């Protein structure tokens, strides 16, 4: 990043990566990992396992 | 995957995909025209022809 730029963003403009504006650092935003949830199950007339 | 789209993986793999290929191409050197309407016959692919 250049010194006077705070933070940049992504193809989907939406943030990307942020600086602290403490100190001198880079910080990526990476979201944290989420997913589907999918149940096998049998027939409801066989097992409810 | 990170914006939220999921790619799904296949039911078939490579290896199993590459199977049935495999398999295929060795039973239509085997029986040729006969294992599709029924159960495979040995014929020499000389006589095939």
């Keep these: 990043f250049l010194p006077f730029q705070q933070f940049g963003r992504d193809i989907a403009d939406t ?27 049998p027939g409801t007339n066989t097992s409810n396992q | 995957k990170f914006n939220g ?4 993986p296949p039911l078939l793999t490579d290896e199993m995909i590459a199977q049935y290929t495999s398999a295929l191409l060795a039973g239509t050197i085997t029986s040729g025209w006969t294992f599709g309407a029924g159960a495979a016959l040995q ?3 000389a006589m095939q022809m």
């Design chain 1, 15 to 41: 943030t990307d990566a942020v600086r602290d504006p403490q100190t001198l650092e880079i910080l990526d935003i990476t979201p944290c990992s989420f997913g589907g949830v999918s149940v096998i199950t």
């Design chain 2, 5 to 8: 789209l999921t790619v799904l």
């Design chain 2, 43 to 45: 014929i020499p692919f």
